mmCIF file of C-alpha atoms and ligand atoms in Angstrom:
data_model
loop_
_atom_site.group_PDB
_atom_site.id
_atom_site.type_symbol
_atom_site.label_atom_id
_atom_site.label_comp_id
_atom_site.label_asym_id
_atom_site.label_seq_id
_atom_site.Cartn_x
_atom_site.Cartn_y
_atom_site.Cartn_z
ATOM 1 C CA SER A 2 -10.475 -8.452 -31.068
ATOM 2 C CA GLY A 3 -11.322 -9.465 -27.495
ATOM 3 C CA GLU A 4 -9.387 -6.668 -25.766
ATOM 4 C CA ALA A 5 -10.158 -3.857 -23.285
ATOM 5 C CA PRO A 6 -10.431 -0.259 -24.541
ATOM 6 C CA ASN A 7 -7.726 2.001 -23.050
ATOM 7 C CA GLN A 8 -9.895 4.656 -21.380
ATOM 8 C CA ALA A 9 -7.061 6.723 -19.947
ATOM 9 C CA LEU A 10 -7.424 10.517 -19.631
ATOM 10 C CA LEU A 11 -4.682 12.869 -20.905
ATOM 11 C CA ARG A 12 -4.827 16.532 -19.779
ATOM 12 C CA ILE A 13 -3.480 19.660 -21.483
ATOM 13 C CA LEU A 14 -2.172 22.619 -19.458
ATOM 14 C CA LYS A 15 -0.730 26.177 -20.124
ATOM 15 C CA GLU A 16 2.925 27.330 -19.692
ATOM 16 C CA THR A 17 1.484 30.532 -18.111
ATOM 17 C CA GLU A 18 -0.281 28.275 -15.446
ATOM 18 C CA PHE A 19 3.178 27.066 -14.171
ATOM 19 C CA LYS A 20 5.699 29.036 -12.124
ATOM 20 C CA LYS A 21 8.944 27.024 -12.635
ATOM 21 C CA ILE A 22 11.415 27.600 -9.748
ATOM 22 C CA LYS A 23 14.656 25.477 -9.785
ATOM 23 C CA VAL A 24 16.573 23.047 -12.066
ATOM 24 C CA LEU A 25 16.425 19.393 -10.949
ATOM 25 C CA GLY A 26 18.023 17.739 -13.968
ATOM 26 C CA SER A 27 19.729 18.384 -17.316
ATOM 27 C CA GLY A 28 19.716 14.845 -18.810
ATOM 28 C CA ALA A 29 20.733 13.699 -22.298
ATOM 29 C CA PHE A 30 17.145 14.009 -23.609
ATOM 30 C CA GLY A 31 15.504 16.996 -21.873
ATOM 31 C CA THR A 32 15.443 18.761 -18.495
ATOM 32 C CA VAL A 33 13.481 18.343 -15.235
ATOM 33 C CA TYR A 34 12.483 21.352 -13.090
ATOM 34 C CA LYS A 35 11.106 22.161 -9.598
ATOM 35 C CA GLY A 36 7.855 23.703 -10.775
ATOM 36 C CA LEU A 37 4.604 24.709 -9.085
ATOM 37 C CA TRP A 38 1.123 24.402 -10.641
ATOM 38 C CA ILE A 39 -1.461 27.157 -9.868
ATOM 39 C CA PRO A 40 -4.722 26.311 -11.739
ATOM 40 C CA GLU A 41 -7.301 28.927 -12.923
ATOM 41 C CA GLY A 42 -10.094 29.621 -10.474
ATOM 42 C CA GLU A 43 -9.096 27.166 -7.690
ATOM 43 C CA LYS A 44 -7.286 28.454 -4.568
ATOM 44 C CA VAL A 45 -4.518 25.827 -4.922
ATOM 45 C CA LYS A 46 -0.705 25.458 -5.395
ATOM 46 C CA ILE A 47 0.632 22.005 -6.402
ATOM 47 C CA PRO A 48 4.339 21.076 -6.371
ATOM 48 C CA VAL A 49 5.248 19.601 -9.817
ATOM 49 C CA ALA A 50 8.236 18.267 -11.890
ATOM 50 C CA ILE A 51 8.653 19.446 -15.541
ATOM 51 C CA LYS A 52 10.352 17.535 -18.405
ATOM 52 C CA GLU A 53 11.204 19.157 -21.807
ATOM 53 C CA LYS A 61 12.806 15.161 -31.783
ATOM 54 C CA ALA A 62 15.204 13.770 -34.459
ATOM 55 C CA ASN A 63 13.294 10.736 -35.977
ATOM 56 C CA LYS A 64 10.194 9.977 -33.807
ATOM 57 C CA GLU A 65 8.237 12.141 -31.298
ATOM 58 C CA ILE A 66 8.208 11.707 -27.535
ATOM 59 C CA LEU A 67 4.712 10.630 -26.468
ATOM 60 C CA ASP A 68 5.110 6.821 -25.989
ATOM 61 C CA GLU A 69 6.744 7.847 -22.619
ATOM 62 C CA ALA A 70 3.444 9.464 -21.582
ATOM 63 C CA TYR A 71 1.081 6.900 -23.188
ATOM 64 C CA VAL A 72 1.828 4.105 -20.659
ATOM 65 C CA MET A 73 2.293 6.729 -17.872
ATOM 66 C CA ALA A 74 -1.476 7.427 -18.155
ATOM 67 C CA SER A 75 -3.043 4.007 -19.065
ATOM 68 C CA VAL A 76 -1.922 2.609 -15.673
ATOM 69 C CA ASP A 77 -3.333 5.818 -14.039
ATOM 70 C CA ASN A 78 -6.944 4.606 -14.488
ATOM 71 C CA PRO A 79 -7.259 2.905 -11.039
ATOM 72 C CA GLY A 80 -4.752 4.500 -8.634
ATOM 73 C CA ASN A 81 -1.748 2.804 -7.005
ATOM 74 C CA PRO A 82 -0.176 5.046 -4.341
ATOM 75 C CA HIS A 83 3.351 3.715 -5.079
ATOM 76 C CA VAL A 84 3.482 4.260 -8.859
ATOM 77 C CA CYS A 85 4.476 7.793 -10.034
ATOM 78 C CA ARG A 86 1.639 9.500 -12.026
ATOM 79 C CA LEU A 87 1.479 12.075 -14.889
ATOM 80 C CA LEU A 88 -0.825 15.035 -14.319
ATOM 81 C CA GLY A 89 -0.782 16.203 -17.961
ATOM 82 C CA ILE A 90 1.260 17.935 -20.663
ATOM 83 C CA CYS A 91 1.916 21.423 -22.097
ATOM 84 C CA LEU A 92 2.179 21.968 -25.875
ATOM 85 C CA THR A 93 4.551 24.936 -26.349
ATOM 86 C CA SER A 94 7.174 24.761 -29.249
ATOM 87 C CA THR A 95 9.351 22.775 -26.782
ATOM 88 C CA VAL A 96 6.672 20.493 -25.095
ATOM 89 C CA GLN A 97 6.449 20.091 -21.258
ATOM 90 C CA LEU A 98 5.719 16.796 -19.380
ATOM 91 C CA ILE A 99 4.243 17.553 -15.896
ATOM 92 C CA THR A 100 4.253 15.072 -12.908
ATOM 93 C CA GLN A 101 3.675 15.403 -9.089
ATOM 94 C CA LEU A 102 6.845 16.355 -7.175
ATOM 95 C CA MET A 103 8.742 13.732 -5.070
ATOM 96 C CA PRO A 104 11.105 16.057 -3.165
ATOM 97 C CA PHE A 105 13.810 13.604 -1.962
ATOM 98 C CA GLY A 106 15.013 12.591 -5.447
ATOM 99 C CA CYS A 107 15.783 9.029 -6.459
ATOM 100 C CA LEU A 108 16.101 6.203 -3.849
ATOM 101 C CA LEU A 109 19.681 5.334 -5.050
ATOM 102 C CA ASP A 110 20.743 8.864 -3.835
ATOM 103 C CA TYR A 111 18.826 8.348 -0.534
ATOM 104 C CA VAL A 112 20.703 5.150 0.472
ATOM 105 C CA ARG A 113 24.068 6.860 -0.418
ATOM 106 C CA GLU A 114 23.399 10.278 1.223
ATOM 107 C CA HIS A 115 21.314 9.181 4.210
ATOM 108 C CA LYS A 116 23.161 5.760 4.379
ATOM 109 C CA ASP A 117 24.039 6.208 8.084
ATOM 110 C CA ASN A 118 20.474 6.820 9.442
ATOM 111 C CA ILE A 119 18.455 4.112 7.690
ATOM 112 C CA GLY A 120 16.486 2.010 10.180
ATOM 113 C CA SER A 121 15.479 -1.636 9.540
ATOM 114 C CA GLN A 122 11.829 -0.493 9.461
ATOM 115 C CA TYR A 123 12.569 2.105 6.666
ATOM 116 C CA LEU A 124 14.320 -0.502 4.547
ATOM 117 C CA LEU A 125 11.750 -3.472 4.749
ATOM 118 C CA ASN A 126 8.901 -0.962 4.209
ATOM 119 C CA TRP A 127 10.367 0.417 0.947
ATOM 120 C CA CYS A 128 10.539 -3.241 -0.229
ATOM 121 C CA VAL A 129 6.776 -3.730 0.509
ATOM 122 C CA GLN A 130 5.835 -0.461 -1.303
ATOM 123 C CA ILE A 131 7.918 -1.443 -4.391
ATOM 124 C CA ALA A 132 6.321 -4.895 -4.530
ATOM 125 C CA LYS A 133 2.826 -3.244 -3.999
ATOM 126 C CA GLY A 134 3.368 -0.849 -6.930
ATOM 127 C CA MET A 135 5.022 -3.671 -8.923
ATOM 128 C CA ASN A 136 2.058 -5.966 -8.201
ATOM 129 C CA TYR A 137 -0.236 -3.249 -9.589
ATOM 130 C CA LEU A 138 1.758 -2.971 -12.872
ATOM 131 C CA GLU A 139 1.395 -6.803 -13.255
ATOM 132 C CA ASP A 140 -2.442 -6.475 -12.676
ATOM 133 C CA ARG A 141 -2.542 -4.113 -15.748
ATOM 134 C CA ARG A 142 -0.552 -6.788 -17.737
ATOM 135 C CA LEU A 143 2.428 -4.351 -17.995
ATOM 136 C CA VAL A 144 6.215 -5.169 -17.829
ATOM 137 C CA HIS A 145 8.328 -2.166 -16.533
ATOM 138 C CA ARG A 146 11.659 -3.619 -17.900
ATOM 139 C CA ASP A 147 13.741 -1.175 -15.791
ATOM 140 C CA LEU A 148 13.206 -1.863 -12.069
ATOM 141 C CA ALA A 149 16.235 -0.263 -10.304
ATOM 142 C CA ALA A 150 16.916 1.959 -7.197
ATOM 143 C CA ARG A 151 17.363 5.011 -9.522
ATOM 144 C CA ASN A 152 13.782 4.529 -10.971
ATOM 145 C CA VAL A 153 12.073 5.076 -7.527
ATOM 146 C CA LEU A 154 11.396 8.543 -6.031
ATOM 147 C CA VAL A 155 10.900 9.783 -2.474
ATOM 148 C CA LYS A 156 7.561 11.643 -1.822
ATOM 149 C CA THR A 157 8.359 11.447 1.954
ATOM 150 C CA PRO A 158 11.062 9.143 3.608
ATOM 151 C CA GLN A 159 8.036 6.887 4.405
ATOM 152 C CA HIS A 160 6.210 7.181 0.997
ATOM 153 C CA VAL A 161 8.154 6.115 -2.170
ATOM 154 C CA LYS A 162 6.785 5.674 -5.832
ATOM 155 C CA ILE A 163 8.039 3.873 -9.031
ATOM 156 C CA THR A 164 9.005 6.276 -11.883
ATOM 157 C CA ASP A 165 10.901 6.352 -15.315
ATOM 158 C CA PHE A 166 8.838 3.571 -17.071
ATOM 159 C CA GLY A 167 10.768 3.934 -20.391
ATOM 160 C CA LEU A 168 10.196 0.371 -21.632
ATOM 161 C CA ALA A 169 6.828 -0.479 -20.017
ATOM 162 C CA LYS A 170 5.115 -2.954 -22.411
ATOM 163 C CA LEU A 171 1.368 -3.761 -22.293
ATOM 164 C CA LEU A 172 0.216 -7.396 -22.828
ATOM 165 C CA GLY A 173 -2.880 -8.780 -24.580
ATOM 166 C CA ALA A 174 -5.526 -11.125 -23.071
ATOM 167 C CA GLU A 175 -3.902 -14.263 -24.548
ATOM 168 C CA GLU A 176 -0.305 -12.900 -24.331
ATOM 169 C CA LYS A 177 2.359 -13.504 -21.553
ATOM 170 C CA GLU A 178 5.728 -12.889 -23.353
ATOM 171 C CA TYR A 179 7.843 -10.156 -25.107
ATOM 172 C CA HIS A 180 10.316 -10.113 -28.051
ATOM 173 C CA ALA A 181 13.007 -7.363 -27.791
ATOM 174 C CA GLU A 182 15.584 -5.862 -30.273
ATOM 175 C CA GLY A 183 18.463 -5.304 -27.796
ATOM 176 C CA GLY A 184 19.355 -1.649 -27.212
ATOM 177 C CA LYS A 185 21.174 -0.180 -24.174
ATOM 178 C CA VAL A 186 19.287 -1.989 -21.289
ATOM 179 C CA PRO A 187 21.357 -2.549 -18.083
ATOM 180 C CA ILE A 188 22.578 -6.190 -18.211
ATOM 181 C CA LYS A 189 23.452 -6.151 -14.455
ATOM 182 C CA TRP A 190 19.716 -6.030 -13.541
ATOM 183 C CA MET A 191 18.686 -8.333 -16.379
ATOM 184 C CA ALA A 192 17.209 -11.769 -15.839
ATOM 185 C CA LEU A 193 18.990 -14.588 -17.740
ATOM 186 C CA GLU A 194 16.128 -15.002 -20.331
ATOM 187 C CA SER A 195 16.240 -11.280 -21.288
ATOM 188 C CA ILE A 196 19.970 -11.594 -22.049
ATOM 189 C CA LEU A 197 19.774 -14.913 -23.929
ATOM 190 C CA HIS A 198 16.620 -15.270 -26.137
ATOM 191 C CA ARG A 199 15.480 -11.739 -25.117
ATOM 192 C CA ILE A 200 12.296 -12.810 -23.194
ATOM 193 C CA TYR A 201 10.660 -10.296 -20.792
ATOM 194 C CA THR A 202 7.890 -11.425 -18.450
ATOM 195 C CA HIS A 203 6.637 -10.238 -14.974
ATOM 196 C CA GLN A 204 8.986 -12.947 -13.512
ATOM 197 C CA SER A 205 11.940 -11.214 -15.297
ATOM 198 C CA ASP A 206 11.061 -8.014 -13.355
ATOM 199 C CA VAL A 207 11.341 -10.108 -10.135
ATOM 200 C CA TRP A 208 15.058 -10.741 -10.930
ATOM 201 C CA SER A 209 15.437 -6.925 -11.180
ATOM 202 C CA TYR A 210 13.512 -6.638 -7.864
ATOM 203 C CA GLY A 211 16.120 -9.031 -6.375
ATOM 204 C CA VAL A 212 18.859 -6.649 -7.594
ATOM 205 C CA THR A 213 16.849 -3.543 -6.502
ATOM 206 C CA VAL A 214 16.547 -4.752 -2.868
ATOM 207 C CA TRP A 215 20.160 -6.141 -2.986
ATOM 208 C CA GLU A 216 21.205 -2.527 -3.908
ATOM 209 C CA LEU A 217 19.261 -1.099 -0.936
ATOM 210 C CA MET A 218 20.820 -3.659 1.444
ATOM 211 C CA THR A 219 24.365 -2.853 0.231
ATOM 212 C CA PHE A 220 23.390 0.898 0.782
ATOM 213 C CA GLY A 221 23.752 2.086 -2.828
ATOM 214 C CA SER A 222 26.452 -0.372 -3.896
ATOM 215 C CA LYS A 223 27.452 -1.407 -7.424
ATOM 216 C CA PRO A 224 26.090 -4.836 -8.484
ATOM 217 C CA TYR A 225 28.936 -6.754 -10.181
ATOM 218 C CA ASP A 226 31.464 -3.966 -9.460
ATOM 219 C CA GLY A 227 34.575 -3.848 -11.650
ATOM 220 C CA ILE A 228 32.919 -6.219 -14.127
ATOM 221 C CA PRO A 229 32.439 -5.674 -17.878
ATOM 222 C CA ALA A 230 28.855 -6.238 -19.046
ATOM 223 C CA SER A 231 29.806 -9.084 -21.461
ATOM 224 C CA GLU A 232 30.552 -12.035 -19.104
ATOM 225 C CA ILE A 233 27.324 -11.940 -17.010
ATOM 226 C CA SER A 234 25.650 -14.001 -19.793
ATOM 227 C CA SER A 235 27.725 -17.089 -18.876
ATOM 228 C CA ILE A 236 28.774 -16.031 -15.315
ATOM 229 C CA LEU A 237 25.165 -16.582 -14.212
ATOM 230 C CA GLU A 238 24.838 -19.806 -16.387
ATOM 231 C CA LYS A 239 27.563 -21.447 -14.192
ATOM 232 C CA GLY A 240 25.526 -20.611 -11.060
ATOM 233 C CA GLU A 241 27.351 -17.617 -9.555
ATOM 234 C CA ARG A 242 25.215 -14.732 -8.313
ATOM 235 C CA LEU A 243 25.476 -11.519 -6.260
ATOM 236 C CA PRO A 244 26.896 -12.283 -2.813
ATOM 237 C CA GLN A 245 25.105 -11.975 0.576
ATOM 238 C CA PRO A 246 24.858 -8.379 1.875
ATOM 239 C CA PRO A 247 26.211 -7.688 5.399
ATOM 240 C CA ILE A 248 23.051 -6.522 7.270
ATOM 241 C CA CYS A 249 21.242 -9.487 5.604
ATOM 242 C CA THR A 250 19.916 -12.251 7.832
ATOM 243 C CA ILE A 251 19.390 -15.564 6.010
ATOM 244 C CA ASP A 252 15.608 -14.683 6.068
ATOM 245 C CA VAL A 253 16.019 -11.404 4.032
ATOM 246 C CA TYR A 254 18.816 -12.754 1.845
ATOM 247 C CA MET A 255 17.148 -16.040 0.702
ATOM 248 C CA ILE A 256 14.318 -13.959 -0.801
ATOM 249 C CA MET A 257 16.801 -12.271 -3.196
ATOM 250 C CA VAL A 258 18.393 -15.622 -4.054
ATOM 251 C CA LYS A 259 15.008 -17.217 -4.838
ATOM 252 C CA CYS A 260 14.242 -14.243 -7.148
ATOM 253 C CA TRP A 261 17.294 -15.376 -9.270
ATOM 254 C CA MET A 262 16.142 -18.972 -9.917
ATOM 255 C CA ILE A 263 16.863 -19.698 -13.587
ATOM 256 C CA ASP A 264 13.511 -21.580 -14.024
ATOM 257 C CA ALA A 265 11.257 -18.440 -14.063
ATOM 258 C CA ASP A 266 8.412 -20.236 -12.260
ATOM 259 C CA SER A 267 10.579 -20.799 -9.137
ATOM 260 C CA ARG A 268 10.915 -17.016 -8.573
ATOM 261 C CA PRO A 269 8.189 -15.505 -6.323
ATOM 262 C CA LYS A 270 5.159 -13.470 -7.621
ATOM 263 C CA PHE A 271 5.064 -9.784 -6.426
ATOM 264 C CA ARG A 272 1.957 -10.571 -4.313
ATOM 265 C CA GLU A 273 4.026 -13.123 -2.295
ATOM 266 C CA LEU A 274 6.865 -10.564 -1.938
ATOM 267 C CA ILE A 275 4.395 -8.076 -0.341
ATOM 268 C CA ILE A 276 3.458 -10.811 2.197
ATOM 269 C CA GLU A 277 7.040 -12.020 2.890
ATOM 270 C CA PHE A 278 8.219 -8.450 3.666
ATOM 271 C CA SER A 279 5.048 -7.206 5.427
ATOM 272 C CA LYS A 280 5.533 -9.888 8.151
ATOM 273 C CA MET A 281 9.097 -8.587 8.793
ATOM 274 C CA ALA A 282 7.873 -4.921 8.923
ATOM 275 C CA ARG A 283 5.965 -5.835 12.123
ATOM 276 C CA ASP A 284 9.294 -6.811 13.888
ATOM 277 C CA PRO A 285 12.179 -5.430 11.780
ATOM 278 C CA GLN A 286 14.874 -6.081 14.407
ATOM 279 C CA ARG A 287 14.717 -9.886 13.902
ATOM 280 C CA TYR A 288 15.319 -9.640 10.141
ATOM 281 C CA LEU A 289 17.753 -6.707 9.550
ATOM 282 C CA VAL A 290 21.059 -6.539 11.463
ATOM 283 C CA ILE A 291 21.908 -2.823 11.428
ATOM 284 C CA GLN A 292 24.642 -1.541 13.805
ATOM 285 C CA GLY A 293 22.799 1.150 15.766
ATOM 286 C CA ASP A 294 19.339 0.203 14.306
ATOM 287 C CA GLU A 295 17.108 1.826 16.993
ATOM 288 C CA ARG A 296 19.429 4.894 17.325
ATOM 289 C CA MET A 297 18.962 5.753 13.562
ATOM 290 C CA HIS A 298 16.181 8.078 12.338
ATOM 291 C CA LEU A 299 14.829 9.788 9.073
ATOM 292 C CA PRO A 300 12.140 12.560 8.811
ATOM 293 C CA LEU A 311 3.001 -3.081 19.762
ATOM 294 C CA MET A 312 1.554 -6.667 19.605
ATOM 295 C CA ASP A 313 -1.658 -8.478 20.772
ATOM 296 C CA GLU A 314 -1.221 -12.308 20.243
ATOM 297 C CA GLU A 315 1.021 -15.348 21.201
ATOM 298 C CA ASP A 316 2.004 -17.157 17.914
ATOM 299 C CA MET A 317 2.047 -13.841 16.105
ATOM 300 C CA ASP A 318 4.636 -15.152 13.603
ATOM 301 C CA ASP A 319 3.156 -15.637 10.106
ATOM 302 C CA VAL A 320 0.448 -12.971 10.843
ATOM 303 C CA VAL A 321 -0.248 -10.631 7.891
ATOM 304 C CA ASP A 322 -2.875 -7.818 7.755
ATOM 305 C CA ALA A 323 -5.720 -8.211 5.183
ATOM 306 C CA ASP A 324 -4.848 -4.971 3.293
ATOM 307 C CA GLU A 325 -1.613 -6.735 2.162
ATOM 308 C CA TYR A 326 -3.296 -10.068 1.194
ATOM 309 C CA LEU A 327 -4.131 -10.240 -2.576
ATOM 310 C CA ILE A 328 -4.584 -13.732 -4.185
HETATM 311 C C1 2I6 B 1 17.970 8.782 -9.492
HETATM 312 C C2 2I6 B 1 17.203 9.653 -10.514
HETATM 313 C C3 2I6 B 1 17.898 10.965 -10.776
HETATM 314 O O1 2I6 B 1 19.028 10.997 -11.240
HETATM 315 N N1 2I6 B 1 17.218 12.085 -10.452
HETATM 316 C C4 2I6 B 1 17.544 13.375 -9.832
HETATM 317 C C5 2I6 B 1 16.068 13.288 -9.280
HETATM 318 O O2 2I6 B 1 15.361 14.557 -9.324
HETATM 319 C C6 2I6 B 1 13.991 14.545 -9.407
HETATM 320 C C7 2I6 B 1 13.304 14.044 -10.469
HETATM 321 C C8 2I6 B 1 11.897 14.029 -10.478
HETATM 322 C C9 2I6 B 1 11.092 13.336 -11.432
HETATM 323 C C10 2I6 B 1 11.719 12.613 -12.569
HETATM 324 C C11 2I6 B 1 12.971 11.972 -12.593
HETATM 325 N N2 2I6 B 1 13.311 11.577 -13.815
HETATM 326 N N3 2I6 B 1 12.254 11.941 -14.592
HETATM 327 C C12 2I6 B 1 11.263 12.530 -13.880
HETATM 328 C C13 2I6 B 1 9.953 12.797 -14.500
HETATM 329 C C14 2I6 B 1 9.419 14.081 -14.502
HETATM 330 C C15 2I6 B 1 8.339 14.386 -15.311
HETATM 331 C C16 2I6 B 1 7.772 13.414 -16.119
HETATM 332 C C17 2I6 B 1 8.278 12.121 -16.088
HETATM 333 O O3 2I6 B 1 7.803 11.085 -16.857
HETATM 334 C C18 2I6 B 1 7.231 11.399 -18.127
HETATM 335 C C19 2I6 B 1 9.350 11.803 -15.268
HETATM 336 N N4 2I6 B 1 9.777 13.240 -11.306
HETATM 337 C C20 2I6 B 1 9.234 13.843 -10.238
HETATM 338 N N5 2I6 B 1 9.835 14.526 -9.280
HETATM 339 C C21 2I6 B 1 11.198 14.606 -9.394
HETATM 340 C C22 2I6 B 1 11.929 15.161 -8.319
HETATM 341 C C23 2I6 B 1 13.295 15.098 -8.309
HETATM 342 O O4 2I6 B 1 14.090 15.453 -7.253
HETATM 343 C C24 2I6 B 1 13.562 16.381 -6.300
HETATM 344 C C25 2I6 B 1 15.799 12.430 -10.566
#
């Protein structure tokens, strides 16, 4: 009974009010397009993305993708509204550089240390916000992050985002087709999903970005990981990874869920590094790479107040 009313605001739009241009995707569900939204009256043109049955209807996808949109996090992808033609249209803001997994594989050779550590602050900022709304994303990966600008990235493709009650901090799952590679040990065993289980996936997400779009547990069938992690083995140290940057990812994989760091601590740990990225990421040609300043003595553990949230 003692819960907060979900006062989210869904919006309905017309298929005549969109001027769809190119085809972004053709997935095994629907299709995403490079649209453009020109509203009635207003002298505006907004770049948008457009999605397009057997047993249940698709709406659960958009229900969570609007409840979190009440206060606004700038690093969490948002839904503008929907169109109700015979074949319904889901309409979001356009993030022109695609997913981040295709940005660390295509632009792999021009990724500065600054660009990397920053994307890791943004993902923990947007992932801290989802925790503040008691929601568990359950699919934090490089592929579920889009590029608004090379500097501004946002978390997308919720899919399994589960809301939690006032006196609730756990989740019971029924299996499915969830990627075991990114899954925390509890999720695999007695199928528990908490905010701390998303931290393990954050550890894999950043590990992916440090290996420049590499395959976690490459050449490995998804059935041994259950006991392979029980023995103690984990993903091995990336090359550009100083012991500072790497030990964060290791501490995100501590079996006792309380030992993993909270996303507010991850924002702090990485924000420090983003002030001097040279000392933490060893990239061959660091300063000569590109993609489209101090004032104190013991400026070491110094963090700005915008990134301090206890
Ligand atoms: C790594 C992910 C991937 O394979 N691709 C190609 C890249 O493209 C896009 C996609 C989008 C999207 C988007 C991606 N997947 N779903 C969406 C989306 C669109 C509308 C509504 C929802 O949620 C209900 C989700 N969103 C926005 N902009 C895109 C731009 C792309 O490349 C330019 C996705």
